[PDB]
Amino acid sequence: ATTGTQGYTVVKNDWKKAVKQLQDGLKDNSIGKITVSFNDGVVGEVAPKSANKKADRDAAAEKLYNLVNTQLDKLGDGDYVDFSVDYNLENKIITNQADAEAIVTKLNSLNEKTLIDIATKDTFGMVSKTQDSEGKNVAATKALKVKDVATFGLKSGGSEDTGYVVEMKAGAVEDKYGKVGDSTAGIAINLPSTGLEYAGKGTTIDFNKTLKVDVTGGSTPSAVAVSGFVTKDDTDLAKSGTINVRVINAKEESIDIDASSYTSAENLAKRYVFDPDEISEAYKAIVALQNDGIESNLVQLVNGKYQVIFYPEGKRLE
Amino acid sequence: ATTGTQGYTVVKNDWKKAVKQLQDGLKDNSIGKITVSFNDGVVGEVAPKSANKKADRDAAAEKLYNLVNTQLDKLGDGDYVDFSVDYNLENKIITNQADAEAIVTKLNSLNEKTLIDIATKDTFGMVSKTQDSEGKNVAATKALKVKDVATFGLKSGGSEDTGYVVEMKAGAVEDKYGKVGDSTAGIAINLPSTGLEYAGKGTTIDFNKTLKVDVTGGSTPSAVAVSGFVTKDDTDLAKSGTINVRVINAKEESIDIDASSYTSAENLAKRYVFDPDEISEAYKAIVALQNDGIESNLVQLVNGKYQVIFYPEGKRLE
Amino acid sequence: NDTIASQDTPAKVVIKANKLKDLKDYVDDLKTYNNTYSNVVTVAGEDRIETAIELSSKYYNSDDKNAITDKAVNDIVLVGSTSIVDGLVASPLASEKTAPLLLTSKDKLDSSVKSEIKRVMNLKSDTGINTSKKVYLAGGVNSISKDVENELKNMGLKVTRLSGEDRYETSLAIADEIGLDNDKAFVVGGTGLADAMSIAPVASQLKDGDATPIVVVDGKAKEISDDAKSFLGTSDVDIIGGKNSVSKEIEESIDSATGKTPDRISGDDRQATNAEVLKEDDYFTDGEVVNYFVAKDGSTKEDQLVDALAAAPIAGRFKESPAPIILATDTLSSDQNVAVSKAVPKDGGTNLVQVGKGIASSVINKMKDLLDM
Amino acid sequence: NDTIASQDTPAKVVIKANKLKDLKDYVDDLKTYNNTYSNVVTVAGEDRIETAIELSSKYYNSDDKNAITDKAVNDIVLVGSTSIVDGLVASPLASEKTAPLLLTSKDKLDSSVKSEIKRVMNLKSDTGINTSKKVYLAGGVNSISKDVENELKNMGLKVTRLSGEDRYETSLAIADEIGLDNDKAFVVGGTGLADAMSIAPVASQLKDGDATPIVVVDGKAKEISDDAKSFLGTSDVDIIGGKNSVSKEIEESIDSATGKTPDRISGDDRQATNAEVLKEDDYFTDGEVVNYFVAKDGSTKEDQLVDALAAAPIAGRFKESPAPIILATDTLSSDQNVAVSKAVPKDGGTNLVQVGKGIASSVINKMKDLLDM
């Protein structure tokens, strides 16, 4: 890894849970390759021989742990372990039938979310396939929810090798889109033709983008579509690429501004010296996010709190 | 229009700001019609005679204010004003040259935001158009930022009648996507060919979805794309349709849990009686959003905070 | 991105939080305090007579959600306010006949009680009193004097007295008036006052329309009476109380008469026996007892159990889930605490009715704890 | 119409009855008395030291059905017999390391303890002491003196001392040795001796192979230590005890450090907190806890909780249904009574282990009642 690049920086005490995320990443196929480095020098490569086989993914995870466990557990001052992680969140699968069913339930907990409401004379919504005896659109029986559009469950050919993979199967909808009492025939609802598999895809399902309706035209609508699985990265970094993990021999200082006692920004400056650019880049990303809603990898919503990360040069004198 | 429906509930003290937003909405052409109701009965329609003329939109906004100002300012206990707002966020223009420049500045404040980092031997990122003397990809000079993919400014031909329209023009990028020292040729970065116009088009630019990278292919990436303007509506409601706004004669109780002093849920219960279904539906949407990734219209991210809305039945005895 | 509020609402409550978990907790507490500010009723007057009247006005010829009947009644069950012994098994009668169980002074019908009788039966000057308006006096002349019976007759009502020479014949008079059509009956000892009160709610449970009768038997005799035997016929019997209330001899006597093996619900004291009535699966289902009544136990004075007598019919017919009566004046027993713990669902209780004054606050507080109220 | 009997049978028991119902009842009672005569064991010696030895001999290097290990051990956890404070969080250590938790006098290693050490680790002259034979001293020099540490070293054993200047640093030394690998930890107050004992069985539950660590924090301080913060990292924490043991200030402190909202399991006293540990779903499932331990509560003297300390590792690993420890010297609390009632299935408990001598008989009788034993 290279200092300053995008990636996770784990402190020594949490080396085990971080390595567990990489092991889970190798097991679940999020990770195609991990290049390991002790300090600045490359010492080993971890990569499943065939991603299709379980044993090869487990072998890769065990070797990863064995390689880095003494180096990490006995990590001295100034020492570190870098993992360059070739990943593809799109290839991530669920290797445990219990965890796969946990994702199927995540999806099934959406079944009752309304995507399109029943139509009215005032508001566009769901109308019937056939018009009444006078040639006017009549409201539909039920609202369009997620249970309508797609069913969930683990794939038929699922196994620990191929993975249990929650699979969505597009449904069928006879109901259309329009206003009640209108003479124009209802518009056909386009169901998901892509993103039909969710392997826990090195991601978490983005429910704002997954199974969401896209009406084109509104007051005069011309097309309606429903997206399949659209994920969000568990890190804001892209669905494919490479991330750096680096373990360091540093103490974790969690600074919660809502806390009763936390390091005041004055006493934090008094205890450590910080890189000016590290602060200013984080600050610019915060200002942009505050004023306009602009998201950045530098500042992120994690556990109901906006967070920034700083690695100070060292302690301050006196 | 109807108690319990999706829409805004403005308290009396903020009637001016809410009506100003509808006026601005008529002026900028977000709104094609506002059907106004005093209590349960319809009393007037506000609609510009011709949307292409400024004067007709200003006349519609002044009529709106004149119609509702005494009714809202003198609103008695039990009284209310309902606005059914036919809108088409796609017809929104930016009718003030000052407001258009305010949005261009909104977009320009993103210019320095990195979309893709520079590639390394360890990590996928930005590489050069041509390979080195040995047939390997070499890193690009700079990261891919928003300034590199599109320029902003108001469109030519603009006037208060036709509107100023903030415009995106796709740039040009010679740099590609890959790893440094890799022999496979860098992937072409697909620039925005659609969603190039934004007049504040009755919606706000969703910066989480606007100008966002989509990497496809994984351990071997095969395509990279950048979206144009992807909006999120002033409301959670579709790009076009009808919105219900209601002003009521109630005091606004802002309960911020992050505050030092706020009404405890105990004292809130002691002062008012709440609808059990209003509470439990809001709570269920919170639980679903918390345990699973599921977003809902009942619980929403507004101004960096998750919100629920309650209209208690009345005050409690004693 | 908001809902359209009611026009009569006093406020717009917008609850915001940076952390969804802090919002969740605030909204959860709000739900709890909102629902918790609503469900624990006391039904008591300055007198025991007033407590019974309060019960009649709440549960008979009443629009209350847990009322036994919403229309005017055709039957009253009247009991001597001092004589718990005489009216002891009158609760299931009051249940099956759709009748309030009222208390009256022995010598003079109390004006409060006379008013409740005219109210609950709807007796008027312009309307005919047909042969269906009936008042059952549960007890002899030493419990409800002739003077009182004549005062009820004077208003134009049919007055039938269910009585005998003692508590036993009095109980059969009452039990005979009740069915015995489901091949089932209850038995209690002469001194088993608290036990009769413990089972009274259960007897008062209508099963396929009919209540189950309670019979008092001489618990220290060698055999039960030929009348008890004849009445019981070939039915299943459940004995309530220990050997000091209904001896082994009497259990055998019932076995021999009916040809069926009788059951036994009992403890080392009255509060334990009460706990056991709740534990019994025929009477109450585990994790399905949401409705509860509390009344004094008679430890301080035995005649103070009249509150339970008057409450029992109501507890038996309460909603769609029959309620027991917990007997406790100053303290709950450890057994009652455990019984309620196993009877109530994991989610807790939904109705708690305190009947009468002089029940210490610790008791109610403890019941509220066990029922998550 | 008969079965072929074993040749070693002392008798042919032919049970006859005219009424099939009397046969049914006799055979049912026979079944009950036959099955019930067997599972209520006491584990105690004349001293607390002997009680811990009795626990070690029964549960470590033992053929007993609920033994933590059947083979010779490689690790001992030793605690000062008087100093409950120092060895307080040592139970999950003893659980994960598969090690008996022994008690020793501060100045001289007790001969009985020395004998149990040689016995449980199988130490001999003909066998090499490889680098894996270890003795963990959970406590400083004022709990287990240097003299005792040197006596263990003189035998030829590796002796590691998990200690600090106080209970807090000592607890982290112990928690660090346990390791925080499930992204989960327990926290208790400095004076929460009984609370640490209440959760000790739970911490001692191996979950996906590992025990969960317990950390003692200064419950009246404004913030927890930097060491506690560093050790806890980004893990989920469950606080055991009320605000008088671990203040609200400390809960917030943990929240701020971990970034995760800590849970709190607590009551108004130690017996209530113990009851709450049993009631908590993560630790025990309702209607599925059949195994139970009982130990003194420390009301009469705080140091008498060492019995629970030594018993907790065992309780955590007991069979495949972890057991709690009920803390009670002279009496069970009303909360413990309710908790056990809701924890135990309708069918009752299957194992009850009394740990130590001075537990009143009322307590054991009450536990047997609640568990239907």
Short mmCIF file of C-alpha atoms in Angstrom, two decimals, chain C:
data_model
loop_
_atom_site.label_atom_id
_atom_site.label_comp_id
_atom_site.label_asym_id
_atom_site.label_seq_id
_atom_site.Cartn_x
_atom_site.Cartn_y
_atom_site.Cartn_z
CA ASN C 1 -41.66 13.37 2.71
CA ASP C 2 -44.11 14.20 5.55
CA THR C 3 -47.82 13.23 5.99
CA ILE C 4 -50.82 15.56 5.79
CA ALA C 5 -51.91 16.28 9.39
CA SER C 6 -55.36 16.57 11.02
CA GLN C 7 -56.74 20.14 11.26
CA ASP C 8 -57.48 19.75 15.05
CA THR C 9 -53.90 18.81 15.99
CA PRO C 10 -52.40 21.07 18.73
CA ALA C 11 -48.79 20.59 17.41
CA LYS C 12 -46.50 19.40 14.56
CA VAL C 13 -44.04 17.10 16.24
CA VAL C 14 -40.89 16.70 14.10
CA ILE C 15 -38.44 14.36 15.78
CA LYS C 16 -35.01 14.48 14.20
CA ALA C 17 -31.74 12.72 14.91
CA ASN C 18 -28.31 12.27 13.25
CA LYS C 19 -28.28 8.66 14.49
CA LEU C 20 -31.23 6.52 13.43
CA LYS C 21 -30.65 4.43 16.67
CA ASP C 22 -31.20 7.50 18.90
CA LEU C 23 -34.40 8.23 16.87
CA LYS C 24 -35.47 4.58 17.26
CA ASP C 25 -34.98 4.79 21.04
CA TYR C 26 -36.88 8.11 21.33
CA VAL C 27 -39.81 6.83 19.21
CA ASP C 28 -39.81 3.50 21.14
CA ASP C 29 -39.97 5.29 24.54
CA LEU C 30 -42.69 7.58 23.07
CA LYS C 31 -44.73 4.50 22.03
CA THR C 32 -44.26 3.00 25.51
CA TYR C 33 -45.18 6.10 27.57
CA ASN C 34 -48.10 6.81 25.22
CA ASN C 35 -49.61 3.31 25.70
CA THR C 36 -48.57 3.05 29.47
CA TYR C 37 -50.44 6.28 30.55
CA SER C 38 -53.80 4.32 29.88
CA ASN C 39 -54.91 0.82 31.54
CA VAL C 40 -55.27 0.05 35.43
CA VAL C 41 -58.81 0.49 36.96
CA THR C 42 -60.03 0.40 40.63
CA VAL C 43 -63.70 -0.49 41.35
CA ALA C 44 -64.49 0.37 44.98
CA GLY C 45 -66.88 2.35 47.22
CA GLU C 46 -66.66 3.45 50.90
CA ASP C 47 -68.68 0.30 51.79
CA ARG C 48 -68.66 -3.31 50.52
CA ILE C 49 -72.26 -2.59 49.35
CA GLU C 50 -71.01 0.35 47.33
CA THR C 51 -68.19 -1.83 45.83
CA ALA C 52 -70.83 -4.33 44.57
CA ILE C 53 -72.97 -1.48 43.18
CA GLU C 54 -69.85 -0.02 41.47
CA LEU C 55 -69.27 -3.48 39.95
CA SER C 56 -72.93 -3.74 38.78
CA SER C 57 -72.93 -0.23 37.27
CA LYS C 58 -69.62 -0.97 35.42
CA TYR C 59 -70.39 -4.53 34.23
CA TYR C 60 -74.23 -5.00 33.92
CA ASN C 61 -76.58 -2.80 31.85
CA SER C 62 -73.38 -0.94 30.82
CA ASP C 63 -71.62 0.09 27.59
CA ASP C 64 -68.19 -0.67 29.17
CA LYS C 65 -65.92 -2.77 26.86
CA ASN C 66 -65.63 -5.56 29.46
CA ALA C 67 -69.32 -5.40 30.55
CA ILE C 68 -70.99 -8.77 30.94
CA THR C 69 -74.12 -7.28 29.42
CA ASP C 70 -75.04 -4.04 27.65
CA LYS C 71 -78.90 -4.36 27.93
CA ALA C 72 -81.20 -4.13 31.00
CA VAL C 73 -81.13 -7.33 33.05
CA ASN C 74 -83.97 -9.70 33.96
CA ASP C 75 -82.24 -11.31 36.97
CA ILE C 76 -80.47 -10.01 40.16
CA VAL C 77 -78.50 -12.16 42.54
CA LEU C 78 -78.62 -10.61 46.04
CA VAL C 79 -76.34 -11.57 48.91
CA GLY C 80 -76.23 -10.55 52.60
CA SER C 81 -73.32 -8.07 52.91
CA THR C 82 -72.12 -9.79 56.15
CA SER C 83 -72.96 -13.40 55.08
CA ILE C 84 -70.21 -14.59 52.74
CA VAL C 85 -71.08 -18.20 53.74
CA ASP C 86 -74.62 -18.10 52.33
CA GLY C 87 -73.92 -16.43 48.95
CA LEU C 88 -70.60 -18.25 48.46
CA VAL C 89 -71.51 -20.16 45.20
CA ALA C 90 -73.74 -17.45 43.77
CA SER C 91 -71.09 -16.14 41.30
CA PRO C 92 -71.69 -18.76 38.45
CA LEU C 93 -75.46 -18.18 38.92
CA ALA C 94 -74.95 -14.48 38.40
CA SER C 95 -72.77 -15.37 35.34
CA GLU C 96 -75.25 -17.78 33.60
CA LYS C 97 -78.36 -15.65 34.40
CA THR C 98 -76.61 -12.48 33.18
CA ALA C 99 -77.21 -10.90 36.64
CA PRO C 100 -75.24 -8.52 38.93
CA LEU C 101 -74.33 -9.94 42.31
CA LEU C 102 -75.39 -7.27 44.81
CA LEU C 103 -74.92 -6.94 48.54
CA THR C 104 -77.58 -5.75 50.98
CA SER C 105 -77.80 -5.13 54.69
CA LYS C 106 -79.74 -7.97 56.41
CA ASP C 107 -82.60 -5.87 57.86
CA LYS C 108 -83.14 -2.96 55.39
CA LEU C 109 -82.63 -2.95 51.63
CA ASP C 110 -80.06 -0.19 51.18
CA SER C 111 -81.43 2.80 49.21
CA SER C 112 -78.23 2.68 47.07
CA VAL C 113 -78.95 -1.04 46.28
CA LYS C 114 -82.70 -0.32 45.58
CA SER C 115 -81.64 2.37 43.12
CA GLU C 116 -79.15 0.00 41.39
CA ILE C 117 -81.89 -2.74 41.14
CA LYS C 118 -84.38 -0.32 39.46
CA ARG C 119 -81.46 0.92 37.22
CA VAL C 120 -79.97 -2.44 36.18
CA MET C 121 -83.43 -4.10 35.55
CA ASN C 122 -85.04 -0.93 34.17
CA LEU C 123 -88.22 -1.04 36.45
CA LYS C 124 -90.79 1.78 35.62
CA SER C 125 -94.40 3.06 36.36
CA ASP C 126 -95.55 3.12 32.68
CA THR C 127 -94.12 -0.38 31.83
CA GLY C 128 -95.41 -3.87 32.77
CA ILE C 129 -93.34 -6.10 35.15
CA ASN C 130 -93.89 -9.49 33.36
CA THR C 131 -93.16 -12.91 34.99
CA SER C 132 -89.52 -12.84 33.66
CA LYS C 133 -88.18 -10.12 36.13
CA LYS C 134 -86.56 -12.22 38.89
CA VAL C 135 -84.45 -11.60 42.04
CA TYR C 136 -82.52 -14.48 43.53
CA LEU C 137 -81.76 -14.14 47.25
CA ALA C 138 -78.68 -16.32 47.81
CA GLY C 139 -79.07 -17.12 51.50
CA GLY C 140 -81.53 -17.78 54.33
CA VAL C 141 -83.29 -15.28 56.66
CA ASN C 142 -80.15 -14.78 58.84
CA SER C 143 -78.30 -13.43 55.72
CA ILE C 144 -81.13 -11.53 53.97
CA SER C 145 -84.14 -10.88 56.26
CA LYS C 146 -87.78 -11.29 55.23
CA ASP C 147 -88.18 -7.47 55.44
CA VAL C 148 -85.73 -7.07 52.52
CA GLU C 149 -87.38 -9.86 50.48
CA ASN C 150 -90.79 -8.20 50.95
CA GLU C 151 -89.38 -4.80 49.90
CA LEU C 152 -88.24 -6.38 46.58
CA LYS C 153 -91.67 -8.12 46.19
CA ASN C 154 -93.39 -4.73 46.93
CA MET C 155 -91.69 -3.17 43.85
CA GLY C 156 -93.48 -5.92 41.73
CA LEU C 157 -90.63 -8.40 41.08
CA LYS C 158 -90.64 -12.21 41.25
CA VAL C 159 -88.38 -13.04 44.28
CA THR C 160 -87.01 -16.56 44.57
CA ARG C 161 -84.81 -17.41 47.54
CA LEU C 162 -82.07 -19.98 46.98
CA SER C 163 -81.46 -21.23 50.51
CA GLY C 164 -81.43 -24.11 52.92
CA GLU C 165 -80.89 -24.97 56.60
CA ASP C 166 -77.12 -24.41 56.15
CA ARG C 167 -74.42 -23.38 53.68
CA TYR C 168 -74.56 -26.86 51.98
CA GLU C 169 -78.26 -26.99 51.14
CA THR C 170 -78.03 -23.27 50.25
CA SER C 171 -75.21 -24.07 47.81
CA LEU C 172 -77.23 -26.87 46.13
CA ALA C 173 -80.27 -24.60 45.83
CA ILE C 174 -77.98 -22.21 43.93
CA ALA C 175 -76.15 -24.99 41.97
CA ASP C 176 -79.52 -26.57 40.96
CA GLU C 177 -80.64 -23.24 39.55
CA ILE C 178 -77.35 -23.34 37.51
CA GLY C 179 -77.19 -26.02 34.72
CA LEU C 180 -74.87 -29.08 35.08
CA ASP C 181 -75.41 -29.68 31.31
CA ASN C 182 -71.70 -30.06 30.35
CA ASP C 183 -71.18 -33.17 32.54
CA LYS C 184 -68.96 -30.97 34.89
CA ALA C 185 -69.20 -29.45 38.47
CA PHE C 186 -67.02 -27.79 41.25
CA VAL C 187 -66.92 -28.72 44.94
CA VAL C 188 -65.71 -26.60 47.95
CA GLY C 189 -65.65 -27.14 51.77
CA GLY C 190 -67.95 -25.37 54.29
CA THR C 191 -65.11 -23.14 55.64
CA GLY C 192 -63.42 -22.89 52.16
CA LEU C 193 -64.56 -19.28 51.66
CA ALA C 194 -61.38 -18.09 49.95
CA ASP C 195 -61.31 -21.31 47.84
CA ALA C 196 -64.85 -20.72 46.57
CA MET C 197 -63.73 -17.20 45.71
CA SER C 198 -60.63 -18.53 43.95
CA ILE C 199 -62.79 -20.83 41.70
CA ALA C 200 -65.82 -18.53 41.40
CA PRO C 201 -64.34 -16.81 38.27
CA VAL C 202 -63.76 -20.20 36.63
CA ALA C 203 -67.22 -21.53 37.47
CA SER C 204 -68.45 -18.25 36.06
CA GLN C 205 -66.74 -19.08 32.72
CA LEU C 206 -69.48 -19.98 30.30
CA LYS C 207 -68.49 -23.06 28.27
CA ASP C 208 -70.75 -23.65 25.29
CA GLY C 209 -73.17 -21.05 26.90
CA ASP C 210 -73.60 -22.58 30.44
CA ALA C 211 -71.70 -21.81 33.69
CA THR C 212 -70.32 -24.64 35.78
CA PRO C 213 -72.01 -25.07 39.22
CA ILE C 214 -70.19 -24.98 42.62
CA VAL C 215 -71.40 -27.12 45.46
CA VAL C 216 -70.39 -26.71 49.10
CA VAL C 217 -70.08 -30.05 50.92
CA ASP C 218 -69.51 -30.90 54.59
CA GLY C 219 -65.75 -31.23 54.44
CA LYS C 220 -65.47 -33.03 57.82
CA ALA C 221 -68.38 -35.49 57.22
CA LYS C 222 -67.97 -39.19 56.26
CA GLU C 223 -70.17 -38.79 53.09
CA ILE C 224 -71.69 -35.94 51.00
CA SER C 225 -75.51 -35.53 51.05
CA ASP C 226 -77.96 -37.56 48.86
CA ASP C 227 -78.97 -34.14 47.39
CA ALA C 228 -75.33 -33.39 46.44
CA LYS C 229 -75.05 -36.95 45.01
CA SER C 230 -78.31 -36.66 43.05
CA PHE C 231 -77.40 -33.22 41.70
CA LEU C 232 -73.88 -34.34 40.73
CA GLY C 233 -75.32 -37.52 39.05
CA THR C 234 -72.60 -38.96 36.76
CA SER C 235 -70.53 -35.76 36.23
CA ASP C 236 -66.82 -34.86 36.45
CA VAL C 237 -66.04 -32.93 39.70
CA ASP C 238 -63.13 -30.58 40.54
CA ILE C 239 -62.55 -30.15 44.33
CA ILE C 240 -61.09 -26.81 45.44
CA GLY C 241 -59.17 -26.63 48.75
CA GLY C 242 -56.94 -28.86 50.91
CA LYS C 243 -57.80 -31.74 53.31
CA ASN C 244 -58.56 -29.23 56.13
CA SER C 245 -61.42 -27.81 53.91
CA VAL C 246 -62.67 -31.00 52.12
CA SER C 247 -61.40 -34.23 53.77
CA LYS C 248 -60.10 -37.33 51.90
CA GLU C 249 -63.39 -39.02 52.96
CA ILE C 250 -65.42 -36.50 50.94
CA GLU C 251 -63.24 -36.93 47.81
CA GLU C 252 -63.83 -40.67 47.90
CA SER C 253 -67.58 -40.05 48.54
CA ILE C 254 -67.79 -37.98 45.30
CA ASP C 255 -65.79 -40.60 43.31
CA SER C 256 -68.18 -43.37 44.46
CA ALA C 257 -71.33 -41.34 43.67
CA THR C 258 -70.36 -40.01 40.19
CA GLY C 259 -68.43 -43.08 39.02
CA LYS C 260 -65.70 -40.61 37.77
CA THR C 261 -62.36 -39.71 39.51
CA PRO C 262 -62.61 -36.07 40.87
CA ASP C 263 -59.74 -33.56 40.43
CA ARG C 264 -58.14 -31.48 43.26
CA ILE C 265 -56.88 -27.88 43.07
CA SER C 266 -55.37 -26.81 46.47
CA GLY C 267 -52.43 -25.36 48.50
CA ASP C 268 -51.16 -25.00 52.12
CA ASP C 269 -53.15 -21.73 52.49
CA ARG C 270 -55.75 -19.62 50.63
CA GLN C 271 -53.24 -17.60 48.52
CA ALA C 272 -51.53 -20.84 47.43
CA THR C 273 -54.95 -22.36 46.47
CA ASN C 274 -55.67 -19.16 44.51
CA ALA C 275 -52.29 -19.50 42.71
CA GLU C 276 -53.19 -23.17 41.84
CA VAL C 277 -56.57 -22.16 40.28
CA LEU C 278 -54.56 -19.96 37.94
CA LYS C 279 -51.97 -22.74 37.22
CA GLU C 280 -54.80 -25.23 36.20
CA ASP C 281 -54.94 -25.71 32.37
CA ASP C 282 -58.73 -26.42 32.20
CA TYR C 283 -59.45 -22.96 33.65
CA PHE C 284 -56.67 -20.88 32.10
CA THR C 285 -54.18 -21.44 29.25
CA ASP C 286 -50.44 -20.67 29.79
CA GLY C 287 -49.35 -17.49 28.02
CA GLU C 288 -53.01 -16.53 27.27
CA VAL C 289 -54.14 -14.88 30.58
CA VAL C 290 -54.14 -11.12 29.91
CA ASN C 291 -57.11 -10.03 32.07
CA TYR C 292 -56.80 -10.01 35.91
CA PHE C 293 -58.89 -9.08 38.96
CA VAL C 294 -57.53 -8.45 42.52
CA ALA C 295 -59.56 -8.60 45.73
CA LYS C 296 -58.89 -8.96 49.49
CA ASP C 297 -58.19 -12.50 50.77
CA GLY C 298 -60.10 -12.52 54.10
CA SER C 299 -56.94 -12.88 56.30
CA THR C 300 -57.93 -9.73 58.29
CA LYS C 301 -61.67 -10.75 58.34
CA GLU C 302 -63.40 -13.54 56.35
CA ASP C 303 -66.56 -11.56 55.40
CA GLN C 304 -64.36 -9.11 53.40
CA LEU C 305 -64.31 -11.72 50.53
CA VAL C 306 -67.70 -10.42 49.29
CA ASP C 307 -65.78 -8.19 46.87
CA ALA C 308 -64.44 -11.27 45.07
CA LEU C 309 -67.98 -12.81 45.15
CA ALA C 310 -69.40 -9.82 43.33
CA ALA C 311 -66.37 -9.59 40.93
CA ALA C 312 -66.17 -13.30 39.99
CA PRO C 313 -69.12 -13.45 37.48
CA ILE C 314 -67.54 -10.52 35.67
CA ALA C 315 -64.06 -12.07 35.71
CA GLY C 316 -65.54 -15.30 34.22
CA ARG C 317 -67.24 -13.44 31.27
CA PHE C 318 -64.61 -10.71 30.84
CA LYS C 319 -63.92 -10.01 27.10
CA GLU C 320 -62.79 -13.16 25.12
CA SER C 321 -60.21 -14.26 27.74
CA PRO C 322 -61.58 -15.12 31.18
CA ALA C 323 -59.82 -13.53 34.15
CA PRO C 324 -58.86 -15.01 37.53
CA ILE C 325 -59.17 -13.18 40.86
CA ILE C 326 -55.96 -12.80 42.85
CA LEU C 327 -56.73 -12.85 46.59
CA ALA C 328 -54.48 -10.41 48.49
CA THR C 329 -55.11 -7.78 51.26
CA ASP C 330 -51.62 -6.70 52.50
CA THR C 331 -49.26 -8.93 50.45
CA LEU C 332 -49.02 -11.24 47.41
CA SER C 333 -47.75 -14.76 48.15
CA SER C 334 -44.59 -16.05 46.40
CA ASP C 335 -46.85 -18.71 44.73
CA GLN C 336 -49.22 -16.06 43.28
CA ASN C 337 -46.13 -14.19 41.97
CA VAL C 338 -44.88 -17.39 40.17
CA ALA C 339 -48.40 -18.38 38.92
CA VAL C 340 -49.02 -14.96 37.30
CA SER C 341 -45.44 -15.08 35.83
CA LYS C 342 -46.24 -18.37 33.99
CA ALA C 343 -49.91 -17.39 33.15
CA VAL C 344 -49.16 -14.03 31.50
CA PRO C 345 -47.67 -14.03 27.95
CA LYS C 346 -44.01 -12.83 27.42
CA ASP C 347 -45.65 -9.50 26.29
CA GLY C 348 -47.53 -8.96 29.67
CA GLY C 349 -51.16 -8.26 30.84
CA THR C 350 -53.86 -5.97 29.29
CA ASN C 351 -56.42 -5.46 32.12
CA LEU C 352 -56.04 -5.19 35.88
CA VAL C 353 -59.11 -4.55 38.00
CA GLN C 354 -58.67 -3.83 41.71
CA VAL C 355 -61.92 -4.57 43.61
CA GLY C 356 -62.50 -2.81 46.97
CA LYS C 357 -60.53 -0.59 49.43
CA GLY C 358 -57.95 -1.68 52.05
CA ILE C 359 -55.89 -3.65 49.44
CA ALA C 360 -52.37 -2.37 50.18
CA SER C 361 -50.52 -0.51 47.39
CA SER C 362 -47.59 -3.02 47.38
CA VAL C 363 -50.05 -5.68 46.03
CA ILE C 364 -51.20 -3.53 43.08
CA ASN C 365 -47.64 -2.35 42.36
CA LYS C 366 -46.45 -6.01 42.39
CA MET C 367 -49.31 -7.13 40.07
CA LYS C 368 -48.40 -4.26 37.71
CA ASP C 369 -44.74 -5.46 37.73
CA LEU C 370 -45.68 -9.11 36.90
CA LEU C 371 -48.07 -7.95 34.13
CA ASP C 372 -45.56 -5.32 32.73
CA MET C 373 -47.98 -2.39 33.50
#
